[PDB]
Design a protein around this ligand. Sequence first.
Ligand SMILES: Nc1ncnc2c1ncn2[C@@H]1O[C@H](COP(=O)(O)OP(=O)(O)NP(=O)(O)O)[C@@H](O)[C@H]1O
Ligand SMILES: Nc1ncnc2c1ncn2[C@@H]1O[C@H](COP(=O)(O)OP(=O)(O)NP(=O)(O)O)[C@@H](O)[C@H]1O
Ligand SMILES: Nc1ncnc2c1ncn2[C@@H]1O[C@H](COP(=O)(O)OP(=O)(O)NP(=O)(O)O)[C@@H](O)[C@H]1O
Ligand SMILES: Nc1ncnc2c1ncn2[C@@H]1O[C@H](COP(=O)(O)OP(=O)(O)NP(=O)(O)O)[C@@H](O)[C@H]1O
Ligand SMILES: [Mg+2]
Ligand SMILES: [Mg+2]
Ligand SMILES: [Mg+2]
Lengths: 291, 292, 286, 290
Amino acid sequence: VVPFNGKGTKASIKFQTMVNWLCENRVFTEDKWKLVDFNQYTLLSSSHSGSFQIQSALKLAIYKATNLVPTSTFLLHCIKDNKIVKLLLCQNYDPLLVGQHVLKWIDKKCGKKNTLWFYGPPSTGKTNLAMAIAKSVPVYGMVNWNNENFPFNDVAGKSLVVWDEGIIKSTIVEAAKAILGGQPTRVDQKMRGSVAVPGVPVVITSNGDITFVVSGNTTTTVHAKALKERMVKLNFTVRCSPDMGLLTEADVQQWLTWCNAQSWDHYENWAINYTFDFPGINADALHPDLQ
Amino acid sequence: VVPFNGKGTKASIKFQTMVNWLCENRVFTEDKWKLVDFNQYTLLSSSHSGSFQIQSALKLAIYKATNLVPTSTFLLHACIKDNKIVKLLLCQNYDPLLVGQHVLKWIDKKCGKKNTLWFYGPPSTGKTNLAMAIAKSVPVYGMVNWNNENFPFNDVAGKSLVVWDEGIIKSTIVEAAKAILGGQPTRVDQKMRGSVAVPGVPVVITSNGDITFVVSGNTTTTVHAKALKERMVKLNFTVRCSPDMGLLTEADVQQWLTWCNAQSWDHYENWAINYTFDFPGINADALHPDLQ
Amino acid sequence: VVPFNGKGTKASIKFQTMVNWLCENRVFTEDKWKLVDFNQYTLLSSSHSGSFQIQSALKLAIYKATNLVPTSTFLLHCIKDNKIVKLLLCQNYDPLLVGQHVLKWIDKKCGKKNTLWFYGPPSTGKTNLAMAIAKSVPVYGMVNWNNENFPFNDVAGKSLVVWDEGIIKSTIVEAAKAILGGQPTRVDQKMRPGVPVVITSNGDITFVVSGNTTTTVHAKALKERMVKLNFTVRCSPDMGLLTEADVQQWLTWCNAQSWDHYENWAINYTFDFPGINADALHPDLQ
Amino acid sequence: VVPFNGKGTKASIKFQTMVNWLCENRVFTEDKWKLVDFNQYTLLSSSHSGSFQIQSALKLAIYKATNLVPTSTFLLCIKDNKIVKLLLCQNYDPLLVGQHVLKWIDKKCGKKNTLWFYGPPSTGKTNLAMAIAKSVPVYGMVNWNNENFPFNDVAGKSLVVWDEGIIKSTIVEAAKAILGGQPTRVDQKMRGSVAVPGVPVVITSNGDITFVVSGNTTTTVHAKALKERMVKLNFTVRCSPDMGLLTEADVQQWLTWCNAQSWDHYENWAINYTFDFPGINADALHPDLQ
Ligand SMILES: Nc1ncnc2c1ncn2[C@@H]1O[C@H](COP(=O)(O)OP(=O)(O)NP(=O)(O)O)[C@@H](O)[C@H]1O
Ligand SMILES: Nc1ncnc2c1ncn2[C@@H]1O[C@H](COP(=O)(O)OP(=O)(O)NP(=O)(O)O)[C@@H](O)[C@H]1O
Ligand SMILES: Nc1ncnc2c1ncn2[C@@H]1O[C@H](COP(=O)(O)OP(=O)(O)NP(=O)(O)O)[C@@H](O)[C@H]1O
Ligand SMILES: Nc1ncnc2c1ncn2[C@@H]1O[C@H](COP(=O)(O)OP(=O)(O)NP(=O)(O)O)[C@@H](O)[C@H]1O
Ligand SMILES: [Mg+2]
Ligand SMILES: [Mg+2]
Ligand SMILES: [Mg+2]
């Protein structure tokens, strides 16, 4: 599979440099391009043949950031002052295992446990944490934005699907089962080449148990066992301070930078047998920096 | 036929070379091209002219791979005891020599009316694994489960293989089923392509139960049972398999078919004179010492 | 009329030569072009100006081969050795007369009798002979490929229309009276010649289904437009496909024979085709 | 099974007598009742109860005539009969055919429930079929029903007549069951059993009905299936310009004579019902017709 020779001219080389510059500065939308580099956009729009190049370059940049680059590389660049590390300790979970699992999860390497689920009372910061992760990936999507009868459209081309205040109904149980489990949709099967893999990670925030499928005017539990195998459940029980504020990329990347530097032995021991719930803080193995 | 005495420019020769290169590297989709070679794709998509060239090259490469070059040449290659497929066939009591030799004719549409292979048996006996192994070797194939429920046979043309997994035939589409399973092209095929006859696509079917019985409402009917038997060939996978045989690979398929091509064809010509709905099993003495 | 004074460039003359090449080699479809000369097709498909010429040349070649050139010349290139000659002798039909009629029938010189009809028991070789002619003419079209309720789409541009094992429904009988009679469709008249039609069937086609009952209202009108041939004797399985050459040698030989015999019967075109006259059998056919 | 111990009043006995009278004179339609006896109809129509009694009597008479009595009862020197002359011209045994007609109308032929007449036009195909249809109490015609629903209101008839018929691929499935004598699903859901009504069918056509019309072409998939359920007759000989409309009297005389003769020659053919009806055997032809 040696690459074709194809010696290109300067016009194509400049376009390729622009495509690389798009990925390097995370410019994936027309609005972001206008907000960042207005002069180049104005110059490119002086002609139809120059306007076609914008639409040509954006698609290639998005595809490169989605499939040709590991997503975790966009995340990885004191520790005891990081808000997420402080926040996760307030919920009585080990920050190191959570951070280590997320990096393994975002690269679709957890196996069939593709979907994370955040559950707890309101005003515990579940939604705030989910937004920070979604803000850091190249492109993210929502189930809230999609149409009510077709909430699982526009899945392809996204690195993370966020479902806020979610709930599952019986009319969409067959679609949710495939997407939450990482199984590719038939669109990818009939567009790409047979059972592929891309799929997409999913993060869910909820104020109630989502394993209860809503059918008619009755709550049912036919699929409770089937759903649980696909998620890792976190209980956000402790209310957070009202003035914590929103989380940003610098907070998440700093937190994720520390986690990657530690040994994988602690995570890989539990990773052998995946459990529906996530283990809590173990004082016999807490990292010395967090003691 | 004397070819038209035209001569192309530098760009035309480059485009023809690119079409050949696409054929040689088994690239037939946009995603495959982006995965294999991103640089050439970017260079081609840098301008409006190249965006049309990409589509033309892909459309020509698919046609060249499917209609101009025999499919079996993509299977053969350019420790026979240890081949996984040979062991799997022996576990299910079938001769690896006859199975491989029949494929080299069925995949080439040379078997006449019997255009389909049928896999039957209990679950977890290895029906799906072998079926997908053949598919991964041919250039492009289509599986029925992708299509719409009411329209099962879309995009059948232009494919080297049709895959139907654990499917069941309904009476509402039994009329179209006898067409593809029989190897005769659909009505639209002749019209768009002028000739009353254009060969069909080979089909492979896996099933846990007898599909010769057609679903008709909430009732099973056997009126079409006779018609399916001369269009099909049956194999029985009656032995379960331990979880010690992972997914099969194209390397196993190529090695298996390579050996079957080199051996003599007398053992196949005897059966090929009058095809039988049942595929004969292992013969104790006919097994060659290379597999004894 | 004096042609225009326009002088073309190198590219235009090359395109005109390409059209002549396509017309000469009977390359009227994209699939045939790919199967015959893949190199030229790949060269042309490199850009827009090359791809447009493919469609333009195909359309011009079809028009030239259908309207500006007599179709019979496309068919003309041991007479007893030909398979078709024996086949017509078995059915008690004179090979010379039927051969001459086909040339006039394909050339629209038989007046209103624009339709041929093969009648007989099943498996008597009717479709084998009929399909042989369809592969000899430049372009042919079958009724069976068309939509069930629109059987007569894309009739213009075909050198021959074939209707195999067909039956006439009273809901569409009025359209059949036109095409089988050779009258041009009203759409052809608005935008701007008939197309020969051949019908093979097992029963009597003059009966028209009307509901769940047969009726004979249209039996009289359909008789004038058609010629009936009887294929009664079953064919041996070893005959196989009839080659386009077998038609070519048969038609070419019948062309050179004396034509005055056919003109005598041509004075009053009967619905029934006359059988073999033993006093008129050609010596070479014996 | 013992009849109920109840007793009917004087008025109910009159209605019971009226029901028997309707069956006795083959009065199954309102027009027939008006034509035959106007005084009684006018007297009955004087009020609500009399009008309702008309409907009740008609329904009960139809049921009694079609379900509780064998049809052959309504059908019950011979050289002068015109029907005998007709079959002799068509080269068929007058005695053998009549016995089959008696068994067929009584649903005693098993699967082969349908007759078929074939031949060139103007040879007596339709005339004979209508004469038999007139003799039985009630008959139905396929041509009267709607095109998309050719088999509506099949039950309740002693015979169903199909003239110049042709089978469309859309309705080929419904044709298989009814022509084969299989009961309709509608009656099974209503009556409760799995096989009850039973309807003989007679078909006359000028073309081969084994072929099924599908789209704009002919198919032979269903050819063998229909052959099992049908019997074929060839009317290949011409017929005089007059051959006056055959009457019920002509039919009744012919079948009565056939039933009187010995039945032994029939059941030999009934061992295995052949698709094609055997022709005249000049050796076995009855001496009266020799
Ligand atoms: N403007 C803000 N943006 C983000 N987080 C904020 C903001 N103001 C306060 N917060 C913090 O976020 C907490 C609640 O934010 P939110 O993300 O809605 O939490 P939650 O528990 O997921 N909410 P709920 O949707 O009610 O279940 C507050 O208690 C603060 O600690
Ligand atoms: N990717 C894989 N993961 C796990 N097991 C595999 C994989 N590929 C092959 N196998 C095993 O290889 C064997 C092939 O079985 P398979 O062909 O799937 O059987 P089957 O009867 O057609 N299956 P089913 O789809 O349940 O009807 C089984 O033992 C599988 O467990
Ligand atoms: N595909 C074929 N290959 C070889 N021989 C063929 C083929 N099709 C037909 N024949 C031969 O051609 C002769 C008659 O062919 P066929 O087209 O079936 O005739 P026909 O009278 O038009 N049939 P039918 O369609 O039943 O009316 C016989 O000798 C056949 O053996
Ligand atoms: N009104 C009539 N009643 C009785 N017989 C008639 C009548 N008119 C003509 N006939 C003659 O009766 C014979 C049969 O009549 P008919 O029932 O029309 O024949 P058929 O063979 O069933 N006709 P077709 O339906 O065209 O196949 C023929 O000799 C007719 O000439
Ligand atoms: Mg929330
Ligand atoms: Mg045919
Ligand atoms: Mg009649």
